[PDB]
Design a binder for this molecule. Structure first.
Ligand code: O9V
Ligand code: NA
Ligand code: ZN
Length: 268
């Protein structure tokens, strides 16, 4: 029997996938998780006692982004091993393709939280390899179900690319992406490139956005905005065609913006 249900904060959440919590934890009808330190527990009573005792009111690591009540914490896998292991076990409940949960030292984790009077409440995260040979600026990215499709995933996607910009590099999320992950990345890519085309070669768009040329090309192909000439993809769009796409339905929800002014981060 596997963990099939968790209590975290004020949410009960059904699992989507197997995650390798220890066997005696999976046998319980429900797993209880401290929303601040991510300690997982077998019983409501041990959960209630921990809450009265736990002094954490936010993730560990350093707050590298804060605007109003939106906050991002950078957490090194080597400095906060247990925390990051528990984060990975949590994420695996909602990610089919994640495979790494206990060797967290090669990773840095970026925790998105939403703050109120009580503390900084975890929304989701993405992990990133400290040294990515394949040029991946995201290893795994996960939004907890009650926060999905509400702008938090787009924020985190945009955030990963702001780091890539500061690193003077391009990057792409590690594949395979989840079903909702694909739609989210394609929508973010379209929004960003269409906005830049409204306000340029494919190499220019890549340097301005840190989106890889392949991801730019595949996105422009889905928008039918690229011509092919003698082995080279070429951007072929009229300023009116861009506006037609942009005012369409799906680009109407107001995003949580990444304000680079509020991002306190220096590249390694
Ligand atoms: C738990 C498994 C998957 O977890 C995720 C992962 C990602 C990358 C997500 F983006 C989301 C998510 O919630 N997307 N919807 S969205 O934020 O409103 C959005 C709107 C427009 C353009 C992009 C995103 C959930
Ligand atoms: Na649920
Ligand atoms: Zn705790």
């Amino acid at each position: 029997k596997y963990v099939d249900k968790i209590h975290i904060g004020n949410y009960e959440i059904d699992a989507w996938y197997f995650s390798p919590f220890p066997e005696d934890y999976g046998k319980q009808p429900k797993l209880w998780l401290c929303e601040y330190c991510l300690k997982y527990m077998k019983y409501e009573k041990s959960y209630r006692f921990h809450l009265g005792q736990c002094q954490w009111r936010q993730p560990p690591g350093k707050e590298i982004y804060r605007k109003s009540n939106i906050s991002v914490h950078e957490v090194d896998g080597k400095d906060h091993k247990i925390y990051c292991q528990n984060l990975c076990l949590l994420a695996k409940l909602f990610l089919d393709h994640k495979t790494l949960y206990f060797d967290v030292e090669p990773f840095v984790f970026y925790i998105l939280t939403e703050v109120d009077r009580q503390g900084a409440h975890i929304v989701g995260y993405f992990s990133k390899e400290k040294e990515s040979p394949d040029g991946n600026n995201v290893s795994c990215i996960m939004i907890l179900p009650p926060y999905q499709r509400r702008g938090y995933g787009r924020f985190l996607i945009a955030f990963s690319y702001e780091l890539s910009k500061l690193e003077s590099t391009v990057g792409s999320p590690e594949k395979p992406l989840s079903d909702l992950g694909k739609l989210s990345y394609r929508s973010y890519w379209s929004s960003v490139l269409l906005e830049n085309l409204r306000d340029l070669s494919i190499k220019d768009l890549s340097q301005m956005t840190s989106i890889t040329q392949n991801d730019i090309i595949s996105t422009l192909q889905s928008l039918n905005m690229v011509k092919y000439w003698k082995g080279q993809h070429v951007i072929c769009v009229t300023p009116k065609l861009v506006e037609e796409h942009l005012k369409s339905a799906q680009y109407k929800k107001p995003p949580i913006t990444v304000d680079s002014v509020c991002l306190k981060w220096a590249p390694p």
